[PDB]
Scaffold this active site. Structure first.
Site, mmCIF file in Angstrom:
data_model
loop_
_atom_site.group_PDB
_atom_site.id
_atom_site.type_symbol
_atom_site.label_atom_id
_atom_site.label_comp_id
_atom_site.label_asym_id
_atom_site.label_seq_id
_atom_site.Cartn_x
_atom_site.Cartn_y
_atom_site.Cartn_z
ATOM 1 N N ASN A 9 2.212 9.308 -16.939
ATOM 2 C CA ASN A 9 1.330 9.859 -15.911
ATOM 3 C C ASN A 9 2.147 10.785 -15.014
ATOM 4 O O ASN A 9 2.935 10.320 -14.186
ATOM 5 C CB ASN A 9 0.678 8.732 -15.109
ATOM 6 C CG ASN A 9 -0.231 9.243 -13.996
ATOM 7 O OD1 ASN A 9 -0.522 10.439 -13.906
ATOM 8 N ND2 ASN A 9 -0.681 8.330 -13.143
ATOM 9 N N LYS A 11 1.132 12.503 -12.593
ATOM 10 C CA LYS A 11 0.553 12.514 -11.240
ATOM 11 C C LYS A 11 0.444 13.973 -10.790
ATOM 12 O O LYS A 11 0.247 14.874 -11.614
ATOM 13 C CB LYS A 11 1.358 11.609 -10.316
ATOM 14 C CG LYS A 11 1.432 10.172 -10.833
ATOM 15 C CD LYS A 11 1.874 9.193 -9.753
ATOM 16 C CE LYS A 11 2.014 7.799 -10.335
ATOM 17 N NZ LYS A 11 2.376 6.809 -9.290
ATOM 18 N N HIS A 92 -7.021 4.611 -11.579
ATOM 19 C CA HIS A 92 -5.650 4.513 -11.095
ATOM 20 C C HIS A 92 -5.648 4.084 -9.635
ATOM 21 O O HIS A 92 -6.532 4.453 -8.859
ATOM 22 C CB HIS A 92 -4.913 5.852 -11.248
ATOM 23 C CG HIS A 92 -3.430 5.748 -11.044
ATOM 24 N ND1 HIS A 92 -2.844 5.768 -9.797
ATOM 25 C CD2 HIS A 92 -2.416 5.617 -11.935
ATOM 26 C CE1 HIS A 92 -1.531 5.654 -9.926
ATOM 27 N NE2 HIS A 92 -1.245 5.561 -11.214
ATOM 28 N N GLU A 94 -4.104 5.006 -7.169
ATOM 29 C CA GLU A 94 -4.178 6.079 -6.183
ATOM 30 C C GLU A 94 -5.617 6.547 -5.987
ATOM 31 O O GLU A 94 -6.038 6.804 -4.852
ATOM 32 C CB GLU A 94 -3.249 7.225 -6.588
ATOM 33 C CG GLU A 94 -1.788 6.857 -6.312
ATOM 34 C CD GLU A 94 -0.797 7.446 -7.300
ATOM 35 O OE1 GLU A 94 -1.136 8.420 -8.005
ATOM 36 O OE2 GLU A 94 0.339 6.925 -7.360
ATOM 37 N N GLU A 162 -1.532 -2.415 -13.069
ATOM 38 C CA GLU A 162 -0.649 -1.911 -12.023
ATOM 39 C C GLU A 162 -0.353 -3.016 -11.031
ATOM 40 O O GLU A 162 -1.283 -3.482 -10.358
ATOM 41 C CB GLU A 162 -1.289 -0.743 -11.288
ATOM 42 C CG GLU A 162 -1.537 0.496 -12.104
ATOM 43 C CD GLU A 162 -2.101 1.588 -11.216
ATOM 44 O OE1 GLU A 162 -1.310 2.242 -10.501
ATOM 45 O OE2 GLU A 162 -3.335 1.752 -11.204
ATOM 46 N N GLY A 168 5.354 1.006 -4.038
ATOM 47 C CA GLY A 168 5.466 1.558 -2.705
ATOM 48 C C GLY A 168 5.740 0.555 -1.606
ATOM 49 O O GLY A 168 5.797 0.951 -0.433
ATOM 50 N N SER A 208 6.671 0.037 -11.943
ATOM 51 C CA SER A 208 7.782 0.978 -12.007
ATOM 52 C C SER A 208 8.526 0.771 -13.320
ATOM 53 O O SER A 208 9.135 -0.280 -13.539
ATOM 54 C CB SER A 208 8.708 0.783 -10.810
ATOM 55 O OG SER A 208 9.884 1.563 -10.955
#
Length: 245
Positions: A9, A11, A92, A94, A162, A168, A208
């Site tokens: 991805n 992004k 996703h 985000e 995820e 983060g 990650s």
């Protein structure tokens, strides 16, 4: 049995020259037993498909839930297919948490994308407060439950977990923690869809993932591959593709 799947991805990263650079290293020595897909920005679907070798699939990073209409800024599965691309990433974290996309909308997008002939990577996963409340299973099972009514063809679905609680936040998701969620998701598929679907559906890890940790994660038992973030922008991605080699 389940074919190893590695999605990259990108992004909101890339331009023509940077995409040429990624293509250059993706012509390197890729494991022939890995299914590889790259998710490029919305405006580079055509460019990426045109220049990426045919053995690599191309995914849009989002789409809407109907073929056309008054939705300024959106693109449809029909357009993604018109761009020569076969895949779309949906839900996703985000999109869910920066842009507020709710479960019902993600489910409807998944249903429309499958009906239109795309393959889909639906993303699920729990936040830090949800995990620390001991609600990991409640959340991801409910996210799965929201999608199932719109999954018309499980052979064209790859589920991505995820660990949003670890993305983060500075916290570490360990291989056992990832494996435990993947195993519980596969059992949920066993109990709520079918044993056949649970045994054939890829569940990929979208925490990650780096060249440094990919080998630890690739063979835990129920991790079928990766949805990779920043490491997909550099030649390290080839190592991750070859994580089982």
């Amino acid at each position: 049995q389940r074919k190893f799947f590695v999605g990259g991805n990108w992004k909101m990263n890339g331009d023509k020259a940077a995409i040429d650079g990624i293509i250059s290293f993706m012509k390197g020595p890729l494991n022939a037993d890995t299914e590889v897909v790259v998710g490029c920005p919305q405006c580079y679907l055509m460019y990426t498909r045109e220049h990426m070798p045919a053995n690599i699939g191309v995914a849009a990073q989002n789409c809407y839930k109907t073929a056309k209409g008054a939705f300024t800024g959106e693109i449809s599965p029909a357009m993604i297919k018109d761009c020569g691309c076969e895949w779309v990433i949906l839900g996703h974290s985000e999109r869910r948490n920066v842009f507020g996309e709710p479960d019902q909308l993600i489910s409807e997008k998944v249903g429309h994308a499958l009906e239109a002939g795309l393959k889909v990577i639906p993303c699920i996963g729990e936040k830090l407060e949800e995990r620390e409340s001991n609600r990991t299973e409640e959340v991801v099972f409910a996210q799965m439950k929201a999608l199932v009514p719109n999954i018309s063809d499980w052979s064209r679905v790859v589920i991505a977990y995820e660990p949003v609680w670890a993305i983060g936040t500075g916290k570490t998701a360990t291989p056992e923690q990832a494996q435990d969620v993947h195993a519980k998701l596969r059992q949920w598929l066993r109990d709520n869809v079918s044993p056949q679907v649970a045994e054939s559906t890829r569940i990929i890890y979208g925490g990650s993932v780096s060249a440094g940790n990919c080998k630890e994660l690739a063979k835990t038992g129920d991790i079928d591959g990766f949805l990779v973030g920043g490491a997909s922008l550099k030649p390290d991605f080839v190592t991750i593709i070859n994580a089982r080699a």
